[PDB]
């Protein structure tokens, strides 16, 4: 291809250290695949909040 392709990846931190990258990559890939871009990121920050569920 020759169009400028974009890349989206996320990373977490529990204060102590970074989390594993394979499960976070699979989770963000599946969440973007299932919801979208403008909706998937809201869901991933809502699940990284995790105050209730």
């Amino acid at each position: 291809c020759f169009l400028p392709m974009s890349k989206i990846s996320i990373a977490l931190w529990k204060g102590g250290e970074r989390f594993n990258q394979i499960d976070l990559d699979e989770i963000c890939y599946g969440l973007i695949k299932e919801y979208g871009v403008k909706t998937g990121l809201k869901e991933i920050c809502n699940v990284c909040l995790f105050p209730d569920m």
Partner: protein, 63 residues
């Protein structure tokens, strides 16, 4: 030899008729196989099974 030749001619005609019938049956069975293995319902259930497996994997890892 003459009467058995007439008998074998009649039986060979019956055998050729059964051979044509088995040819038609083979063609019908293989056509049903090729229509069932590439049908829309098979691909639809395949995609739905793949989506259910991906959803249960995502739900397990998110939990």
């Amino acid at each position: 030899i003459n009467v058995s030749n007439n008998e074998l001619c009649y039986q060979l005609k019956q055998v050729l008729a059964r051979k044509e019938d088995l040819n038609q049956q083979i063609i019908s069975v293989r056509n049903e196989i090729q229509e069932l293995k590439a049908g829309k319902d098979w691909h639809d259930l395949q995609n739905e099974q793949a989506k259910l497996n991906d959803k249960v994997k995502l739900n397990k890892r998110l939990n």
